[PDB]
Structure 1
Amino acid sequence: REVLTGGHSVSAPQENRIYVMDSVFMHLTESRVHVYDYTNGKFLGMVPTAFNGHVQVSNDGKKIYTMTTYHERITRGKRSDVVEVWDADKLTFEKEISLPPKRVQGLNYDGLFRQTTDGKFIVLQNASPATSIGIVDVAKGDYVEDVTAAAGCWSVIPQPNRPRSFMTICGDGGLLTINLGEDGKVASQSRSKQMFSVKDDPIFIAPALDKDKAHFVSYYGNVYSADFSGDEVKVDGPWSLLNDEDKAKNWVPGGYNLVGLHRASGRMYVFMHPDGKEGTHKFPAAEIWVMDTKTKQRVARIPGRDALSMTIDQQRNLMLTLDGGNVNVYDISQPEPKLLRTIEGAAEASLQVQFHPVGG
């Protein structure tokens, strides 16, 4: 006789797993994370995330963190904003961490729900609608700091070269850096000079993030950089993604999580489309451009498959792209990306995919 059992772990190794955050916008109270094996397209499991969930995997690979909002009766009753900690292998709920009722409700940009490099703090965006950054101490399971210094700023860019530091983009067109102490409270902060003109050349918030610097692309196809090799962030730019031929056809960037960086090579990947004009900044990719960030020149261009978001795995030299429903898997071990497969129907309405971390 067969017997149905539960308690099982995900059937594929962590290193095969990717996380497609399905907003399910048509039924946004039933958002969820779909877990897939990128090597073969197999669906491995899922984590429910209620209304407009956000997700990330712990840097050590052991846990999944979600952020969501509940109400006692969904559309009425008391609000509870939370972070949840889930076991990554059993895909089971472990702990709820209470947040103040102002966690960002919005589309799944990476920078709205992040963590420190050391993994000890979750760093999340609030909007009430006044903005601030919230800090969750994972070990304590507590909301421990509210960075009001970040009012008027948006999104969290961790610094991979420091244990508990991150940056945010401010309304002055500069960056605010926050260094947290080992208690998760702000230990110090600094503000950069103006990097970009908010009015004249607004940047997309998505970083192309290196170990000690970050690049940003603008609505008009320029590139700005923030170097955080030192305590003070040094900013520069613009250089243009575009040559004269590109400009003639009005190529500009577009998408959501629209850039990535391959750290070993310095290649930056950007979704681009022709016939750019006001209002096209979220258009699907006609192409992916591959830029050498050292020479500040394009090295390759490939079809974009209508992608809107991407993510990079450094150690396996992979790029995923995502068109809202389907995930494309590319090998980026050489300058021209090679399409390996497409996972069809990975989500109904996803703008974010992420790899399971393997780098510890």
Structure 2
Amino acid sequence: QTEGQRGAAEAAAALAAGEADEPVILEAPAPDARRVYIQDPAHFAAITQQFVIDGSTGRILGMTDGGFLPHPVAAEDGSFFAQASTVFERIARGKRTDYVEVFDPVTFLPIADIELPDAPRFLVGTYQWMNALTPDNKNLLFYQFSPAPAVGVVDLEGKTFDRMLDVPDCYHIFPASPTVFYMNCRDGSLARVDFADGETKVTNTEVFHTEDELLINHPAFSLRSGRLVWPTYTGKIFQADLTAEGATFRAPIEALTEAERADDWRPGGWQQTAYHRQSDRIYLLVDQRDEWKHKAASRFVVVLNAETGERINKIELGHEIDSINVSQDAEPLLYALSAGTQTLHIYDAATGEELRSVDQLGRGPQIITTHDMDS
């Protein structure tokens, strides 16, 4: 039975009985490990939308309006979800305003609207971890690109803008503790920034890759466990377990086989990396492509052991997909989103089969977000 069918039967009955129609404003079910968010940059449109979906059934719970290239985030425990957005006085022109909003998780009502001084948001195609919430959910950290590298601290508890932290030529943010997060730098290393007690102290780990080794823009990461998974255009994967004390790299795992890498296999798409925390498994979007077609869609997902580097499965999507992620529950779902058809595809992580799809999601849906609350 379909959604619109179940709805019809439901209403036909209410009608058979007395049961009048008393129009009201809904509330979304409680947040669970199966809820997923689909932000939609819409190919650089001045305004955009994000859809909140129940993954177990593919039913839309509600939506959220955002401005220009906004960044979504979701407190792993489900206490809420937010976004950093940008609006203008006259649609796309005039006085700019960057701000952060925090939404009640069931009413979707904006419980906080915090303006960011001097429009400091890095206006850029959206990559999962370019912004992040401290693990204690008391702050939101975003990046500024011009005039100089900087990280803005947004106090979610006191609903206000803290300050800007000056950082090195590094990008992305990966929290590890209430006052420590790491960034990937131009110099080949990671930066460790401690912003505790009103001040910032920066450190640099050792270089863990060469100028020939291109880390993609879409690294996976788990705020809960600290695991960072970062590929290169070839599928080579540097991991690291961020702690606070510092980053402990692991032995690089080639996600693809020399036989595959031998036959043009390469990772491609948008959000191509997924790390299932509770299981320590990794999912990477890949297909056979030219070396300079790294943003095209892919039709396959490779799953492998994050500790051994041994392949567990190679799922065949059946569609041109651009982004993926998985639910953190014990029987994870595999999210496969296509900006080309604005359709989300949902598969059983274990079997790799498609269970259901949800279409008509904006103009070019690209970012998937979930809550890691299961365990």
- Report the TM-score, using the length of structure 2 for normalisation: 0.85
- Of residues 224, 230, 237 in structure 2, which corresponds to 1:223? 237
Task: Give the deviation of 1:301 after TM superposition.
Answer: 0.7
CA distance in 2, matches of 1:113, 1:289: 26
Match of 2:323 in 1: 309
Within 5 A, what are the aligned runs for 1:35-54?
35-54=52-71
Match of 1:121 in 2: 139
Q: Structure 1's 176 and 359: CA in aligned 2 closer, same or farther, altered over 3 A? A: farther
- Of residues 3, 22, 25 in structure 1, which corresponds to 2:43? 25
- Contact preservation (8 Å) 1:192, 1:235: no
CA distance in 2, matches of 1:214, 1:353: 17
Task: Give the deviation of 1:78 after TM superposition.
Answer: 1.3
Task: Give the deviation of 1:110 after TM superposition.
Answer: 1.1
Cα-to-partner distance string for 1:319-349 (whole Å, 9 max, x where unaligned)? 21211112122332x4x53432222223321
Task: Give the deviation of 1:217 after TM superposition.
Answer: 0.7
- Contact preservation (8 Å) 2:165, 2:200: no
Is it true that 1:297 corresponds to 2:310 in the alignment? yes
- Contact preservation (8 Å) 1:132, 1:153: no
Is it true that 1:202 corresponds to 2:210 in the alignment? no
CA distance in 1, matches of 2:204, 2:37: 34
Which letter maps to 1:339? E
Is it true that 1:69 corresponds to 2:69 in the alignment? no
* Residue range with higher mean Cα deviation, 204-213 or 136-145: 204-213
Cα-to-partner distance string for 1:186-213 (whole Å, 9 max, x where unaligned)? 564431100111x201111333335143
- Contact preservation (8 Å) 1:227, 1:235: yes
Match of 1:171 in 2: 186
- Contact preservation (8 Å) 1:98, 1:143: yes
Is it true that 1:268 corresponds to 2:282 in the alignment? yes
CA RMSD of aligned residues (A): 2.3
CA distance in 1, matches of 2:305, 2:345: 22
Cα-to-partner distance string for 1:37-76 (whole Å, 9 max, x where unaligned)? 2222222221111222222223342322121111222233
CA distance in 1, matches of 2:214, 2:156: 34
Match of 2:17 in 1: none
CA distance in 1, matches of 2:95, 2:289: 47
Match of 2:73 in 1: 56
Within 5 A, what are the aligned runs for 1:85-100?
85-100=102-117
CA distance in 2, matches of 1:330, 1:264: 18
- Contact preservation (8 Å) 2:335, 2:347: yes
- Of residues 295, 301, 311 in structure 2, which corresponds to 1:288? 301
CA distance in 1, matches of 2:250, 2:129: 21
Q: Structure 1's 52 and 62: CA in aligned 2 closer, same or farther, altered over 3 A? A: same
Match of 1:329 in 2: 346
Task: Give the deviation of 1:116 after TM superposition.
Answer: 0.9
- Of residues 329, 353, 356 in structure 1, which corresponds to 2:368? 353
| Secondary structure in structure 1 of the residue aligned to 2:46 | helix
Task: Give the deviation of 1:355 after TM superposition.
Answer: 2.1
- Contact preservation (8 Å) 2:302, 2:315: yes
* Residue range with higher mean Cα deviation, 72-81 or 109-118: 72-81
Task: Give the deviation of 1:31 after TM superposition.
Answer: 0.2
Which letter maps to 1:142? T
- Of residues 101, 107, 116 in structure 2, which corresponds to 1:84? 101
Which letter maps to 1:267? R
Match of 1:4 in 2: 23
State the 4+ residue runs in structure 1 displaced beyond 6 angstroms. Answer: none
| Secondary structure in structure 2 of the residue aligned to 1:248 | helix
Within 5 A, what are the aligned runs for 1:226-265?
226-229=240-243, 231-236=245-250, 238-265=252-279
- Report the TM-score, using the length of structure 1 for normalisation: 0.88
Bigger-Rg structure (1/2) = 2
